[PDB]
Design a protein around this ligand. Structure first.
Ligand code: HEM
Ligand SMILES: Nc1ccnc2ccccc12
Length: 289
């Protein structure tokens, strides 16, 4: 199964920076969402979940087809709460009806990471909407109540190795869990992209507790939390080495996250030899906007 990137007809970097800017300006404007976290974190989660359905074995799922717009995927229990991201992006899609759904969902994640002071993430256009029958079945996204071996095996399906997995997980610096979406309780409000996930893992005094949904999670006296799968990164000695690396080198973390996240967002897509190079969008701040 081959999905060839096809540039939206006549579009170039200027067109996609306008979309980026629209997203970024709305991220600034809609600041109250989720007790003033804003929409940045849920857009990152959205970009991940629309990509994380990919299966390297048969090239089903992935970001290319924009299949999250279909009920079966929109209603995946693993996607609970992402409707807020979809609703945020609707007026963007209305203004720029030419951009494909996959392009919009993935670009929203890139925009969010960058506007939250994250690394620059190169981004390629050309995802094409595919029909409803291409929507992957539920159950391809990962469970949060398992161990390092599960995480490692899970991510093999997405062609991610240990460093890619650990880097990608650093997005859990952002936002929080919501009991009504996932059964995990969190109390953070972070919407600045940093390596603090790794620092918190290593520095806090974690206690294994049960939350109000009767699920186990790791909690600290300071008020922080980790999912079982998060905590597994310090239980497994190979992941632990990488955690320590990123805790001690912000730039390395940014660089490896950027690479892994672009890869995640591009899995499944064949880019023609003469496709445009990846775009690196300027932030609002870099543009003086
Ligand atoms: C083993 C893999 C992972 C598991 C089990 C997992 C699980 C979770 C869960 C349970 C939530 C809470 C959802 C809610 O209650 O609203 C969450 C949120 C989040 N996840 Fe992950 N995740 C994984 C990997 C990732 C990856 C790879 C990224 C992106 C690079 C990502 C980005 C996020 C973000 C940004 C949020 C916060 C969303 C918000 O504040 O609304 N996660 N994840
Ligand atoms: N903010 C967070 C801290 C630790 N784990 C998380 C897991 C999912 C979302 C957010 C977090």
């Amino acid at each position: 199964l081959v999905h060839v990137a096809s540039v939206e007809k006549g579009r170039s970097y200027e067109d996609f920076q306008k979309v980026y800017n629209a997203i970024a300006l709305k991220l600034r404007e809609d600041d109250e969402y989720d007790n003033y976290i804003g929409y940045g974190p849920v857009l990152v989660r959205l970009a991940w979940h629309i990509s994380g359905t990919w299966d390297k074995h048969d090239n089903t799922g992935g970001s290319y087809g924009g299949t999250y717009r279909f009920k079966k995927e929109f209603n995946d229990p693993s996607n609970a709460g992402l409707q807020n991201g979809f609703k945020f992006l609707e007026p963007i899609h209305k203004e720029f009806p030419w951009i494909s759904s996959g392009d919009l969902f993935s670009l929203g994640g890139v925009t969010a990471v960058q506007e939250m002071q994250g690394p620059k993430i190169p981004w390629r256009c050309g995802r094409v909407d595919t029909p409803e029958d291409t929507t992957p079945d539920n159950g391809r996204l990962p469970d949060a109540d398992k161990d390092a071996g599960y995480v490692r095996t899970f991510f093999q399906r997405l062609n991610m190795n240990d460093r890619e997995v650990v880097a990608l997980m650093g997005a859990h610096a952002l936002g929080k869990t919501h009991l009504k979406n996932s059964g995990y309780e969190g109390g953070g409000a972070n919407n600045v992209f940093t390596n603090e996930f790794y620092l918190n893992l290593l520095n806090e005094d974690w206690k294994l507790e049960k939350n109000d949904a009767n699920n186990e999670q790791w909690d600290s006296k300071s008020g922080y939390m980790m999912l079982p799968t998060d905590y597994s990164l310090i239980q497994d000695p190979k992941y632990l080495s990488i955690v320590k690396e990123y805790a001690n080198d912000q730039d390395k973390f940014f660089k490896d996250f950027s690479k892994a996240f672009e890869k995640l967002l591009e899995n499944g897509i064949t880019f023609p030899k003469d496709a445009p190079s990846p775009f690196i969008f300027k932030t609002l701040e870099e543009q003086g906007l």
